[PDB]
Amino acid sequence: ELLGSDAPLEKVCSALLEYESKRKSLLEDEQDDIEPVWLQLATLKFIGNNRKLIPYKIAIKNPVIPSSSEACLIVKDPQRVYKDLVNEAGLSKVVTRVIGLSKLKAKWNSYEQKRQLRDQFDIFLADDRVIPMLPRILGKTFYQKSKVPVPVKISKGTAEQLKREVVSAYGATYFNSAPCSSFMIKCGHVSNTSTELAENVESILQFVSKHIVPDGAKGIASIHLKTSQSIAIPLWNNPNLKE
């Protein structure tokens, strides 16, 4: 109702889920990975002037990143204090390793070493204080190969604050802002329920029209949802796009 005075959700999400399930067609390694739901939004104008190396945290009722995924936290020096805080807060099961900014820049400088570090963790969380420096010392090995640090806020230095920031980061999706009139975001997975996927899509659309799209719903031209290889049915189209 916010985009074009209509809410063509739920039914579109249910139809897409049914189509994905219908289109289904020894090994020793197995994982709970599922095909994500890709929501692509089209604007009539360039949303981004230039590429931004800072992920945008879009809150979603249904978490996208699994809570069992390994997370690596980058904190300001010294790293002993942050590591002790994580151990005290009980987040060691999620934040497997804490690496300082100086240690990350020095101890891992080779491209092969940077690639090995990136492939050893499923989620990379960076403190907001050292987020700008993460653009360097990481390079195209991480910031282009599906590893954009999440700007966690742990500047307070409290165990409860760190746990809250970790919970918020794990329970929210990350969207990269880049120069284009088009964006694509991860709204959910195949295992996610139709109602949960619709709620996540609505939250993503509301966030896009609020803090992403300068013109809000007026600047949004078309919105569609699809899978990794499935087609995108028209979820919402602007009735006054010509005007």
Partner 1 sequence: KKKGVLYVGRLPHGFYEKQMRMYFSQFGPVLRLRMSRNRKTGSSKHYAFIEFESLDVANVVAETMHNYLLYGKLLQCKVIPEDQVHENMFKGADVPFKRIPHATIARLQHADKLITRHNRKLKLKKRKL
Partner 2 sequence: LKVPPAIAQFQKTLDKNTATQVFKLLNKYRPETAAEKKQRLVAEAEAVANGKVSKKPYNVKYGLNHVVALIEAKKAKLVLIASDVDPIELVVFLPALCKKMGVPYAIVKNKARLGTVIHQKTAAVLAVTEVREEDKNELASIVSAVDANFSAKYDESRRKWGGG
Partner 3 sequence: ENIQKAIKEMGFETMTEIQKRSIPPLLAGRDVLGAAKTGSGKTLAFLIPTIEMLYALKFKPRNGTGVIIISPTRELALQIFGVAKELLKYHHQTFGIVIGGANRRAEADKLVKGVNLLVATPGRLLDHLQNTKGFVFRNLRSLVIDEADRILEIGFEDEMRQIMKILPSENRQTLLFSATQTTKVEDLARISEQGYVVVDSDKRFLLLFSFLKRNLKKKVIVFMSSCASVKYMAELLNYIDLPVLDLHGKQKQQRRTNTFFEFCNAEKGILLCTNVAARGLDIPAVDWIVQYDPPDDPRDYIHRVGGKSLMFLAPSELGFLRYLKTAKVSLNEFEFPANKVANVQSQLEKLVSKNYYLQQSAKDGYRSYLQAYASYSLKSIFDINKLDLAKVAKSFGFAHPPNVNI
Partner RNA sequence: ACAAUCUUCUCACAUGUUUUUUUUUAAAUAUUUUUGAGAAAAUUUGUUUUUUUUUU
Q: Kindly list the residues in this chain that would bind partner 3 in the complex (CB under 8 A).
A: 26-31, 116, 119-120
Q: Mark the segment that binds RNA (CB under 7 A) among 25-33, 88-96, 192-200, 218-226.
A: 218-226
Choice from 119, 135, 231, 239 touching partner 1 (CB under 8 A): 231
242 binds partner 1, rule: CB under 8 A: yes
| Closest by CA position to 146, among listed 169, 180, 174 | 174
Q: Dihedral angle at the C-alpha atoms of 162, 206, 70, 80, nearest 10 degrees? A: -20
CB of 2 to RNA, least distance (A): 17
CB of 27 to partner 3, least distance (A): 6
Contact 148, 176 (CB under 8 A): yes
**Cα 163 to chain center, whole Å?**
18
Site string for partner 1, 49-78 (x = CB under 8 A): xx----------------------------
Q: Dihedral angle at the C-alpha atoms of 119, 124, 129, 134, nearest 10 degrees? A: 30
- Of 112-131, binders to RNA (CB under 7 A) are 112-113, 115, 127-131
Our CB check for partner 2 shows the closer of 106 and 241 to be 106
61 binds partner 2, rule: CB under 8 A: no
181 binds partner 1, rule: CB under 8 A: yes
109 binds partner 2, rule: CB under 8 A: yes
Choice from 132, 135, 234, 239 touching partner 1 (CB under 8 A): 234
Q: Which does 27 bind (CB under 5 to 8 A by kind): partner 1, partner 2, partner 3, none?
A: partner 3
Q: Alpha-carbon distance 159 to 82, whole Å?
A: 9
Q: Which does 101 bind (CB under 5 to 8 A by kind): RNA, partner 3, partner 1, none?
A: RNA
Q: Return the structure tokens found at 232.
A: 């995108």
Side chain identity at residue 186, one-letter code: K
Choice from 132, 157, 214, 239 touching RNA (CB under 7 A): 132
106 binds partner 2, rule: CB under 8 A: yes
Residues that bind partner 2 (CB under 8 A): 106-107, 109-110, 113
